[model samples]
Target chain A: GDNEWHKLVIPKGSDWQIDLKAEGKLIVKVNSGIVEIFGTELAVDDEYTFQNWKFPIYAVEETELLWKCPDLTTNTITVKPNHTMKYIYNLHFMLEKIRMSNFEGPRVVIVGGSQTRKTSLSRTLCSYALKFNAYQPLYINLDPQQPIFTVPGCISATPISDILDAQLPTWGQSLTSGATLLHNKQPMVKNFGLERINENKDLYLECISQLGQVVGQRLHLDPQVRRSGCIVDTPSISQLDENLAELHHIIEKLNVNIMLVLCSETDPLWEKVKKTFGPELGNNNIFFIPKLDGVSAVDDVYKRSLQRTSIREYFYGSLDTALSPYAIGVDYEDLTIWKPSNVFDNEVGRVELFPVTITPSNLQHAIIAITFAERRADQATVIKSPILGFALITEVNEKRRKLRVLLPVPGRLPSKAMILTSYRYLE
Target chain B: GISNSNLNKNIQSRNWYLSDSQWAAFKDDEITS
Candidate 1:
């Protein structure tokens, strides 16, 4: 027989409170009188966050943790009747399936430091993919503030997760709108967070790696039509101090193709970034686009050849600096000079861009040309290989960040290799 | 747009574990989640 338990009503989207006079552990359960929490001090109004927190009480034969709601609707629970106890609990449970898809190929990761580079490069990549037929690309955008909206033809396998603090206003209704729309339609990508431990580099890396795995598993079914791979867009590497070790792991295991989109107003840390991830990959594979608004055009071949070294040197000064503990024993000046003789090299892959120039008309041409060339390359590669390399397209105008849609000329679509597009954001 | 009006109609009629089982088989041993 079940014990007669008093019932408490907790309104939807409201907090449930329990009172405890003295500090003692309290157990909360869903159904079957199972104790869900232990050592939880009951407080009058103090909040306890328990959304999506996995626990044994959350597991059950019938409903999910979300269905349990303020209380397990179908079950019963017991509590000690005789103590001055009060506790406040917020139970918001939302569950959606998450899928992670891995396209077998080299990874192309675009790291844009500023808003301008981030959006431009993102749009470029997306448009390029649409223009081309490379359908196997997965895009992970790490920018929390400005999320990249998915295009009609393409799907993002990985959901962007952000800090719990980033949940929006109106009880996360707007956030829910975007997230629910994505989950309902394509590969579910979310941005959630684990508690951050200060200076814990390994933890940061592990967290992101876990995120990648989650995404990879969720979207494995909607496999790319042919040989293609994943692309990741990240905020500037400069922001990652304790997190660089994890960042490196993402680059290595993910086989990310690194793109450094720079302008005359580039972040100084760009060179150090090259020294860190650029070696073994080579400068040719690393594409650098100068500020299109300032530069008149790509330097002529002869002049470009003469200026490339100085450009490289200038980049070194701009980017390299206070090296991380993980970056030790490497010659910061020459990547070739440093390393163990038999170093395990990450699989390095090349991603080409459309020719870019400073002039507005030329910029459009560059976009179209690069889009055209990338499609051809993707087509050729898919015919010969099992995986298509990722492609990225970017626009870096300093002016506006409005969505710039470029219609492709007829017969411009490539039949292989994936593209992840971006554009320069004005803000 | 197709509404999910019939989402729960088949909730009990079909084996709920079927989707989970298929997903488990597709799981790669190399990946750590």
Candidate 2:
């Protein structure tokens, strides 16, 4: 009675929507036909497990599905044809054409608010690009709050060579996060660490600039990646007046050829984007696409849980794979810990790092990035150095001047230099 | 003299990405450190 097989035959343009619970496990196998659950298609042989959320399956053609669920009656399950699929598919085809003709491919930047389904559109476009041309488009998450891979505080640029796993949480998993069933790509991560970016606007922009520079270098290095092009997902910035200048700056940094705002024809953000960048509007196409109807409303609680899950998966691996993170005790004096200087500190360099004294109060569940910089390296070298791996400070021993850390990899930590992040693991 | 300390000066542009904020403290109720 508990574990029962359910059946559904969905025709083309029909939608099969269901609610997924965090505590529940449901394995759905696509027996036949063609159906995709928000960009990621369900294959005949591959049985995708749904957990910790709501997703509606939209049939591209006649489809048959089978699912094993403990309980499915409580959650909202509906069948309605939300015909927004046509528009997204059209956008994918439009970009795919550009990829064919142009050497640089389709360089897209998604700008919208939190609820506008920016990440979904980016993933959808990337998924289609992978399928159509077998191109690995670079997915750049400019929104540090919602992680594509890595943790919440870090922004990443990942070249997508494969389909996104619907079973995994928070869009997709990172290849840099260690062993996985699929060959996920490594992302170039830059830790912003500022939860409230308004506090330090200058430094926030700096991260964007640096990230763009590396992305430029990456594109220059690889011709395949250059042709495949890029997709940038921005933060929930509805206002375009005080923020228009920042957006302008971001576009310049990334060399964004297209500005895709997720809003209806009525929104001022879209109108202002047209008004403000009037000259460049023609050169770099600006289009507005409305948010998908079936996107689940995410709250603060849900976002926090999502962030925590991302952090957990980074070190401990995903559901299919598990990793045993190593723990080691290091003398406090040996480690070179750098904390970002705050506005209150009256630091000359706002983005400068100062030596931080370890306290139990500050070290509680804190995540630190091990930089590629050497122990006695310059401030310039340490600040811009790419991270090797992230480690959580497990316990602090003041009496013996030792800090026990849990590392994702085996053996000793690669470097003594570490940058403390704003994120804290609750569990 | 102007570039004397962490404070008392204007922000100078540099090739750095580290931020200027203290980690806002939040320890779960179940654990104390």
Candidate 3:
């Protein structure tokens, strides 16, 4: 009673195979096999036309066969055994293929509050993207206010707006979250647009589509390539300003793979983010990085509490013992139970060599360390031990204070013995 | 005035990221404008 594809189950350990052939007319053969079918083209009411149609088999067994019909345009055909053997059968077929991207090239996009952080991150992703033979990674800076979209003379630079504008034609095309065609099947593109993106739905879709076109043109890749196509580093959504709403709209319309990495000291940005996009969207691709020593007040009391104490006089003493051995060497490979900084290669010694000298201010030092570690994981092990882990003096509520062991967690005392203290401010 | 014209030429040359073939296509389109 059915004309579509189906599957059938047979007894285990059965040895039998079925051979299918379509020829002149219509016929079915059992054992000692040979059946012939024949049909002529353009015969509307010809019985041979209806009977000669053959369906592909998905699976089968000795006494059971599973079949599928790609179309329901013709009437069903009944089968009778030449011998006196009975058989069970099933049919099944899918309406359309589920589409997705197969592109595996690395893609990079810039996103952050500071211009320096954005640039460094882009440079890092671009460097690694070049290692793979079939990769042509894209670099995008979505910062409308500053608009640092390129790396001086690099060919991979593309502006955020240009990416959005390239997708103007795909607005009403078949809304799929996977592989789709543009300008016929020659130029293929893939996306995950049907998934939940943040508020910037339009821009996000446009960006993905533009990336699709660019990937096809530059890398000489077909749009059908979907896996590992691009990697985007987004700016703090708060800094989007008026464009935030538009950005949010774009995020909702596309499919994307996201990875979030943040320091514990940067929780304020997360707080604002949760407020802006609510808990669901805010926490979707968020990573928390810890700030160890920078939680301090103006004096020693503030420093003792890790800068979280209410008063400048009552510094937390429990943390002082923890802070005492800040400058000690950490055998990161041996110590397995510390909080991760959410930055790439955090545990693997990916760190800045000259943390104190290369960057300005203690906060900048921490940023440089995290950024350096992200780009080169082995640097974390070679960095000279600091007197007090990573210390930071932040201005909370207009009051100057110091915080020690800013982002990393306090673990069991290492085998090495050393005392910790804040490096004097170089003014 | 020559320096200003040279500056414009520098800007045009900076667009080499588009490739020589791409620049030729763009150059063809620029004539009617």
Candidate 4:
């Protein structure tokens, strides 16, 4: 029975969402007609092997499909109609119409609280735009809590030229991911160094502004990208308060023309944001969609595990991509580590030196951003510079005053100023 | 210091990151493999 494949003829308009448990080659074959995983339309009679992945397989038309899970349990599947995904597809059409009519493309920003599928929506549209059109859509992720290509506590934006593969981890791997057949994506990453925005509001906002400035400048040189537009995912999901200043600040910096607010009418912020920012945003620019029903009710523990998965995969490549991270030991005196300065009296991109004698209690599990700024660089230069890569503090020996770190590639650690992010992960 | 040992150890015994049910999912699958 376990050797037999399970076949399901998915009716047109419904998708099969599978939640898997183990890691292996999941055999998916489409016998006839059309079905798609996210926006990747699968061809008929082709046996596709997807690695450990949790994603939906949607039947674009009445289609027959066959699948076999390598090892199942924690394995379950359910059919979900496109009622939820259609709203997103329609948004794609609306944006496409604008492109054809020679109007300004919609720079969409998604706002909602946690578990609203904001990131899911943001990625789906990017996938659809890539599949349906010739242009690439910019996928900007501001959720430092989650990593796109780099580790957590970094804001990343990528102008996607290829399929955003669902089978790979976290919207597929980045250029840093070693050799693979999957399209390699290079994302522009900015270090936030803090997990939560509230922890370093000023610093957080500054990174956002810098990212916006870079993105704005990028769109000017890359006119084709401007026409395809961008989808922004934020941590501001559902937690936004009455003072629309920060939201507006992001809006102003990013030049976001359309705001896709995901919240219910019963929710306080839903009505409040509409009433406060409504008239100003213009009726045509603002639209509210209720949160999708399928969003996982993930707890903090699950979230942390996923974060650790990203961190580990960043240095030690996943099975799909082969990478061997180098673990090296260096004396504490040879290194310079800096973190953002306090919000009070301190300006954005300003930093202060740090250490607790490089003890295991303090340094172990810490993720550090290796910056381009040299050790002799001034504080602003150190904090503001774009990162070269990341390292994880695995262990420290106080007696010898040495710290062991896990790095992505082999070579001596850069003598440049390194920023210590608040992010922590066990090797 | 970072080890999947903790994850593996937790899978059978602690279930710290995930509860008994959560850990059991991986346990059963691994047992078969």
- Candidate 2 chain A lowest-lDDT run of ten: A173-182
Q: List lDDT for all candidates, in order.
A: 0.29, 0.70, 0.25, 0.68
State the displacement of the C-alpha of residue A336, model 4, in Å, after optimal TM-score superposition: 0.8
Residue A292 local lDDT, model 3: 17
**lDDT minimum window of 10 residues, candidate 1 chain A:** A90-99
CA lDDT for candidate 3: 0.25
lDDT of candidate 1 over A54-139, digit per residue (tens): 11111101211112233333344321221111110100000000012333433556654444444334333432342234233344
lDDT of 3 at A203: 29
Collision count for each candidate, in order: 59, 3, 77, 6
Tens digits of per-residue lDDT, candidate 2, A307-345, equal: 887887776666665655666777777677777755555
CA shift of A327, model 4, Å: 2.7
DockQ of each: 0.02, 0.02, 0.01, 0.02
TM-score of 1: 0.33
All candidates in order of DockQ, best leading: 4, 1, 2, 3
What level of docking quality does candidate 3 show? incorrect
Q: Interface RMSD for each candidate model?
A: 23.0, 19.2, 25.9, 17.2
Alpha-carbon shift of residue A404 in model 4 (angstroms): 2.3
